[PDB]
Amino acid sequence: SNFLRLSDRTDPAAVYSLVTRTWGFRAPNLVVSVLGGSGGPVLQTWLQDLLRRGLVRAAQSTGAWIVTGGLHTGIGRHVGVAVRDHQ
Amino acid sequence: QAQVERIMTRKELLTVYSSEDGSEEFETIVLKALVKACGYLDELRLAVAWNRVDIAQSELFRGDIQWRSFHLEASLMDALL
């Protein structure tokens, strides 16, 4: 993966240019920012189906970026599980 | 009556093949009869012992359980051997 420790007061232009040009990421056609996440390692089955069949599949078809927390907990963990199951 | 009481004493070893269950659901029922007896084996190691990759895929895809690293490593060693 590509990681960068960056200050809180970092202008988005520099990091976006780093991602698109230096790290070789295509510019997104859509950005879905996933928020929230109820406590508990187990999500509702319909919610998991929505994350996998709905969000990740649409992101792959439209060439989108899925943006959330990168940590292995909460909604980040659930979106990662959806990505893994889709792949 | 005493014999039936002794039967029900170890009631975790008894499973019922309900009339609702179809024939195509035989193996799954066997699974739910074996792992319940365990509580060593898990559904992944049983799926590897048999040649049923569909059962392994179904078990891995279900989200209610969270398979840990020692389940997966045991199943992978069984599959490699």
Curated annotation (Swiss-Prot), chain B:
UniProt modification remark: Phosphorylation by PKC leads to increase the sensitivity to Ca(2+). Sumoylated. Desumoylated by SENP1.
Tissue localization of expression: Widely expressed with a high expression in intestine and prostate. In brain, it is both expressed in whole cerebral arteries and isolated vascular smooth muscle cells. Prominently expressed in Purkinje fibers. Expressed at higher levels in T-helper 2 (Th2) cells as compared to T-helper 1 (Th1) cells. Expressed in keratocytes.
Residues holding Ca(2+) 1: D42, E43
Binding site for ATP 2: R68
Top-level lineage group: Eukaryota
Subunit structure, as described in the record: Homotetramer.
Function: Calcium-activated selective cation channel that mediates membrane depolarization. While it is activated by increase in intracellular Ca(2+), it is impermeable to it. Mediates transport of monovalent cations (Na(+) > K(+) > Cs(+) > Li(+)), leading to depolarize the membrane. It thereby plays a central role in cadiomyocytes, neurons from entorhinal cortex, dorsal root and vomeronasal neurons, endocrine pancreas cells, kidney epithelial cells, cochlea hair cells etc.
Family membership noted in the UniProt record: Belongs to the transient receptor (TC 1.A.4) family. LTrpC subfamily. TRPM4 sub-subfamily.
Disease: Progressive familial heart block 1B: A cardiac bundle branch disorder characterized by progressive alteration of cardiac conduction through the His-Purkinje system, with a pattern of a right bundle-branch block and/or left anterior hemiblock occurring individually or together. It leads to complete atrio-ventricular block causing syncope and sudden death. Erythrokeratodermia variabilis et progressiva 6: A form of erythrokeratodermia variabilis et progressiva, a genodermatosis characterized by the coexistence of two independent skin lesions: transient erythema and hyperkeratosis that is usually localized but occasionally occurs in its generalized form. Clinical presentation varies significantly within a family and from one family to another. Palmoplantar keratoderma is present in around 50% of cases. EKVP6 inheritance is autosomal dominant.
UniProt remark on domains: TRPM4, is a temperature-sensitive ion channel, it adopts distinct conformations at different temperatures, markedly influencing where and how ligands interact with it. Decavanadate (a positive modulator), ATP (an inhibitor) and Ca(2+) bind to different locations of TRPM4 at physiological temperatures or at lower temperatures.
Protein name, as recorded: Transient receptor potential cation channel subfamily M member 4
Species the sequence originates in: Homo sapiens (Human)
Gene name in the database record: TRPM4
Complete-protein stretch covered: 348 to 434 of 1214
